[model samples]
Target: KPLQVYTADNQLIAEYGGKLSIPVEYKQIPPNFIHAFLAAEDSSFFNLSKEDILSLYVNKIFLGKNAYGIAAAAKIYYNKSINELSIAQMAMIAGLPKAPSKYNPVVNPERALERRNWILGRMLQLGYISQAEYQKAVAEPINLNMPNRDLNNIHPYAGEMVRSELVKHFGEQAIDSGYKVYTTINAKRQAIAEKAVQDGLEAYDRRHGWRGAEAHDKPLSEFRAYANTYPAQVTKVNSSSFEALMQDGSTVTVQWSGMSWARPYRNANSVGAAPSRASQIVKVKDIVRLRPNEAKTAWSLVQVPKVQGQLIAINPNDGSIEAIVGGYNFYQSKFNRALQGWRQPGSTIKPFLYALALERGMTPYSMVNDSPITIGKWTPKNSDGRYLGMIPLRRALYLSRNTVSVRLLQTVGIERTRQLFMDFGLQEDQIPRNYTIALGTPQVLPIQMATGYATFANGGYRVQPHFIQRIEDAYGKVIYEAKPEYACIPCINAQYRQAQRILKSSSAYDMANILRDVIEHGIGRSDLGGKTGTTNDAKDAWFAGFNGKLVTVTWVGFDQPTTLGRREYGGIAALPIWINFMGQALQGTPAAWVRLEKD
Candidate 1:
């Protein structure tokens, strides 16, 4: 039976004479509310006819029926107990489709409940429902509550940094249309490397008492002055430190090598008088103190004095860049020191020098005297300023002695080294046309140095370093594909190959072993084959590492070309970062060995 209209309050203002109809805006309803209304009102709207008795009765009232008068009232009740009332129930739901506002359960609760109950009674009359299922759906009321609209747009600020690059390569239309770019970056490894550098630097500074000079942490400005005035070398050596005698003037230039301390003045004549008398020369020793367990944590503290660094690893076979950390903070600064900064490479250039010598027929076992030798007026000294005379070419490379690279360059000729650099994709104009080439006088980018190193990694192949892999469109059409090319112009130039072979030789492997010793017993550790380098006046500290799989080069210093303070070298300032990055990169990889191909 259709529900009889009975008001609970019974306070009627006025009654419509005949019928009422209304228009509605569908968008006014919330999406969640719309979804709920659909479930409650039209449970089977998919399969029902409009002319069915249940729909016709509801339409008649809207089409002009005098409900207050005796205008032949259509059957107002439903025989819902019949088994075939499913079609009648669906027809009643179809009536609400025209204006759900007038019939929606939440908006018109009285009418909706009446319609629902009437549909249930009709189902009973037509025998489509048992007493149980009908009572269950009626007992469970509809929920119209919904969550607020979402605000997060997918890829907001997407491709911010790469936007220009994408446009430059593919045009603006490609970005608007959403093109897919494939990169060689392994997201997991990139995150791992970034976190390691940041956390590792913080931990290292805390471990070493050298976080800052003052008892409290100080700013870089204050630290810079303190470091330059009282350098680490002066802190290391107190008494009995090394001094140099200038032969021309016979004047002794004393170098404060150890720990820094304020000294009391004494009269030279008395030698042991209190400062009440006239004073002698007063000097402050400059030295750096390591933490109690520094030796155990030496690798972390290796690059302590500097916070920023770059490490580039390439697959020599295709020259795909495997990993790169631009700086300590990529957001604070976008300058990619690895690919942009052109700092002096220090002794990392010695491999090419040695290779040049081999191409000139000097064996790797050839002897190069490491005595005090004069190149015009310039005489370079070892880290200790001591001469190890008559060492083999292999040992010279192993020790990274300055005398060896210069002497080898003497036979290879500076012009040849310049040409070698040009052949390896370095801008020719960048390198000076002089013998200082052996001393790393040419400033080169980290990637350029990496490309130079890749020659040895790939058995003399000079594959260009590439970061992007490929790009695709929405339909999966390849828009761009990186086809790596040889960095060297000619694949088989004899001079380049001869130089390549010498560098890729077993003797060169011995040279790398010497670097391993630097790590093991010298300045660095044995986890990698490394070369440490320092520009004149400690302006730059560099440590470049390589094994069969990866090559990483790092520099430690200020933005401007200022000294690193004290006699900082590659071992002291750059090796720690190299060690940390290489350790993380090769965590699960097996040890690799490099063998030179015989000529």
Candidate 2:
């Protein structure tokens, strides 16, 4: 049977199963085990008596240190339990202990197959099986179930998060105890997230240029001997080309001209100097690998990009996480960026700031100065450096005017803005005490950003983002269940009361309407509205958007903050991921305006 995990509809989302170990007790041995061993080991031994056979079984258990009992041999050779073994499969295992290593199926398949068929033939001569059954069994191949030494995970990042959460709720022992945990992951959405991140990052990397050679210090003669790719050693390099040798006695030339998005390598020593191309950057003795094309006349070799991204989709109505992708590949890295990675929110934080403005009696039609402004020594500029002077407050947000947002923060006061985000579930440390906070300079996690946007999607209620739905014990008894909590009404705390009043009033609805415009005409679709964010130097890109049912946040950047590229804004780098995921997540759902209840 396959080890499996199910979705809400009981559809299998993950499956993993291979060889397993179990301890065997002599007294509990099944009757088939005794019969199988007698036929394969000593065909006439049963004629002596039941007492004689029982004594023989007891003696053999203690005879040789290397000899395995019938049950033990079944697992060691066939990788199956006694009950799961067929008659022919059992006979094969029964013949292994006679000469274990020489009869090992994996290392000595030919010898093992010969021994297995000989035992089957003996069983027929002794009348244990009919002649026809013997003929059929002998024709069957010796199919050995080998252990999967390198098993790949289906949804590794999501699985890792679930494992960590389960351990936190119920001690570490709960994992091996066969507990069934029902999570909020929708497999369909998960597939979309994975593909979007993979394709998005690869495309981003290609735009930069081929970074390095596929192999280092090898010869073309060595590389050509193999039909496919293998790791090679690079021996020589130049401005536009390199050479490598493979173990198979062939070598190949890697030319930058044939590479995709090939560009010059950035030299670290030269400050502000025009860096050299890949040929100049890649040095000899670097190890790389190459893949041969269909013609085998040329090979394609490129390094894996040193980039990472994250996406998290949540059910706005209930705060259930529908899908999440933590990084480019879970096997390459276990870090969960969705829940753990923290980066600047950039312009994504503007909607909340705009929401504060509406709560301060400012209407969408109200005017705000988008021209160059100086506050003390700090001067904030628009992304394009050309500001639209005295634009409507609605147009200011749609354009993501940095100057307008800074002025609005000043009108709302830094303290009030900080408290607003804090009540929206941001930690006190997450909000910086500076005017730049208005421009989304503070760092935030993807989950935190998604939760904040979900408030607008759910008509002002703050819902807790959760993954686990329930946990059942091995016997299917409910050991624990999750009852997610939400903050819908105004709280007793004064700081939270204002947020509740603002969200409950028409201000939340007004902000949501403007955001819808951002989607339809700005960067998103008709039913989706949110903000795009890009930090100074293009170090981080973000898009946090939501509809009436679901909210999603996407972020793309280096693990160690670095420029994404020239003009790589949130709308360009991150919005596509959000758009691709939301297209599938909200499929077949109604596209209606965000509903607001009048006071």
Candidate 3:
């Protein structure tokens, strides 16, 4: 029982238990490749002919890197189709059936090469190839051109989310019964989401300066690339330029342009002086990480970002996940930060509190005291430390005034605000009843924030967030399809659980305008609304924004809960990820502005 998950665009992303395989017809596999496979092992067990046994063995054997057969193995290792392999390359694939890791050319090149050459000689003696062909093939190196392998695990978080949801629904029986899960994730949006998370974290990491290197290695040849960061070992060193050996046997020269930013990191608050030469950044044997430019023309020194983040985008209409990335690199950590990482959201929760004020007969023009107030042992202070007395309601929101949020919560009634938050589908147990919750002291997952924002973006309708849209059994019988809480205004559309109205229609419109004003204060058109939240000590940063029909929440911070850095607010840390994703995802469509109150 293997589970296979596909995106909304029908791209296979995750497969469980069963090996990754693409069955090819007999004619497509080259004769020489088959000859090498036969020579690698003595096939005397089966009563079938050589061709029949060979086809079965080739198609069924595991060839490492999750590739099950030659077709997929070719794509995974050489980034080539089956017919494109040279005789030596064919022998390299052929010997892997006996032992994938022991003779894997990428990792154990010496042993793999030996085994490959032996298979080639066996082929020559077996009359499958001439002596000249064997000589030419054995002389060639096992060069791997990866990324030609095509798509799998593109949206790892989404895939895992689907698997978890599947198991939760069908129990362990689902694992024994292979099923196809069609998720609500859009391929184009998911790609941009991953890139946004990747680029944003890299940008934040660069701002904090390089944290030295991951290792003093990578000549292992098996060490490949991820988001352009490759492991390289220093082979030679000089002041102007240094060279390092790449996994593919190529060497990269790190010019001043690459090592110039190799400033030593002290802490979250500071970094040392910039390096003027390569010697300052690395020594002769120092193993470092270098990233190549898009064209592979030049390289730059880069280290993996220690800061982690999650980007979640949801459809406001039904709360279906459009795009989601739980972490910068899912392989490094399997924890889905979007669904599991519960941290304080700080002032990003202000919009919901302010909306409660609007519900209680307050306008954006309503005046409120921004002065500091002490509640028993607690004294709430504005972020700037200077309180502007009696500011307009919109000004308080736009400035993210901590004092104003607290004062407004005092006036709006705490339990009433808490009820409104609950209506937006946050966990009741997690939200505190104290005054601190007004300042966003309550913790929440990133997806919950997306749900909260979607409630705002969808004109006050509470939506239950969901990703798996439908699932089918092994025999293609429709087993489960999402019956989300639909917000059907007048038409009941044959669905269960109508989307609950959380805010008054008038208040939803008013808050929409005020939210737009929050974004508008900076500069924007159409209907764009969002808020940036930075928690106490800057341990958590968040930017939750939404367009007419889509809501996005991006959270950035250390996984172990440490101060992000000096002045690393939500706008500086998390907003770029949200902005990058929203910009590309909202292209070519007219703004889905909130309907007029008359409608």
Candidate 4:
């Protein structure tokens, strides 16, 4: 069975079933490896009788099934094509069938080396190699090129989603059978999304102080467990430098310049006692952490990030997902934040509130009170705790005035606002029917946020965001196709007519203008329009925005939802990720003005 998955542009994303086992055809096995296998397994292989050949074939067919063939053995041990093997590499592989697990280089390197050298000796005895060749081959190190265990999962998050979608449509056996799934994922956009999430999260983590040493009392033999950090104990300290015993059994001299960041704060008890620039922060016998320099010649202490973030990009016109990154590393956590992570949108939900206000005949120039206002037991205040008092509706949203947004929501009525949110693809039950919804109190997924923003970018047409473009059978026959469905056409028309009384097109375009101000005068680019969102207690930071071509949503927060530190607003935490991704996504597309629909 043969199956393949391709991107929208027809680039192969994943495949199945082709060349699963070694071919029966001769000449496919490399000559050197074949000689080694014969010499190692049977020194009298060349002089075998008919009865012996039959016996060997029978055992290979039944007992050794997958492990008997040289082609299969080569791939299992070294993830390389037969043509790419060296004589030494071939000798190592020839010893595997004797004991597959015991000769696995990755698991038992020492045993694998002995078996490999033994095979080379057998080859030399069988006249398959000269003395010089045997010596050279035996001396070579066991450099096994292991294949990625998760070979089918190239883009981990997306690949998992693809499998899920396929299983949903066809039965679970669809993947096992030879079926091709073509998706809307652009390879270029996927690369950008992955790198952007990694870079942005890592940079944010570095800003926070380093965590303590990885291993303090651990043995040097277990050093690989703390590969990112080197465990060391201070041996001696002076005014200018220090010496430490590294976990790797090496002594390192660390200069004050390298330890500057690691410098401990002066103790309160020693206020009057001034220590020299390099005066011992690390006392002798104290354990410390160290990282290698860029040149790898010396060690510099460093930190690893604990923060996690996610990003998703979608085509506004068709609602096809172009790229998605779930978290810092998909292998560490399989939760797809773009589709499954549900958290309060913070201020990113403000655009929906502003759009409803526009539908209710409020203009960008309309005045709204920005002062602290009490609604029964609840009082809302601006993020800075100071009021701009009666600012324009546009300014309130641009400045993300919390009081003004709450006042607008109170005036618009919670039912109407919640209905509008549902129309844009949010689940009705997931949304809270409170005034705080104006400040984005509802927990929503990044994909839902993307759908809402795409409605605005696509001129008020609700989009069903999808990844799969089509599916095909093994014989290149089309078995399934994706037909995008939309929602809220009549509601969009009514909203547009209401907005037409005040401005052009629909409330979406009117909101688009206010969002433009957010980018042009606020924290984003002129070509894009977006809103920044920060949750209460700084648990989550979000930025959802769009240009004419694509809609993107970014979220930065801990998986467990703790504070992202003080002052980590959406503009600071999430906007940069959006800008970086969009900068590459919209690179050559010509910018144009949003055209409002007319009667």
Can you rank all candidates by TM-score, best first?
3, 4, 2, 1
TM-score: model 3 vs. ground truth: 0.76
Write candidate 1's Cα lDDT for 472-568 as tens digits.
5646687777767632323224223222332434434554555555456652224356677777767676777676667767666566776554535
RMSD of 4: 9.3
**Candidate 3, after superposition: displacement of residue 475 in Å?**
2.6
In model 2, state the lDDT of residue 546: 84
| lDDT tens per residue, model 3, 251-292 | 889888777877888888898898777777787767777888
Candidate 3: the clashing residue pairs are 216-287
Candidate 2: stretches off by over 4 Å: 1-5, 9-152, 168-171, 214-303, 371-377, 384-387, 485-502, 523-525, 596-599
Q: Model 3 RMSD to the real structure? A: 8.0
How high is the lDDT of residue 175 in model 1? 42
Choose the strongest candidate by TM-score: 3
TM-score, per-candidate, Cα-based = 0.52, 0.66, 0.76, 0.67
lDDT of 4 by residue, 515-589 (tens): 877788752246688888889878898888888678999999888888877757654778888888989877777
Which is better, 3 or 4, measured by lDDT?
Answer: 3
Better of 1 and 4 by TM-score: 4
Taken over the whole model, the C-alpha lDDT of each candidate is 0.50, 0.70, 0.82, 0.72
Error of 3 at 188 (Å): 0.2
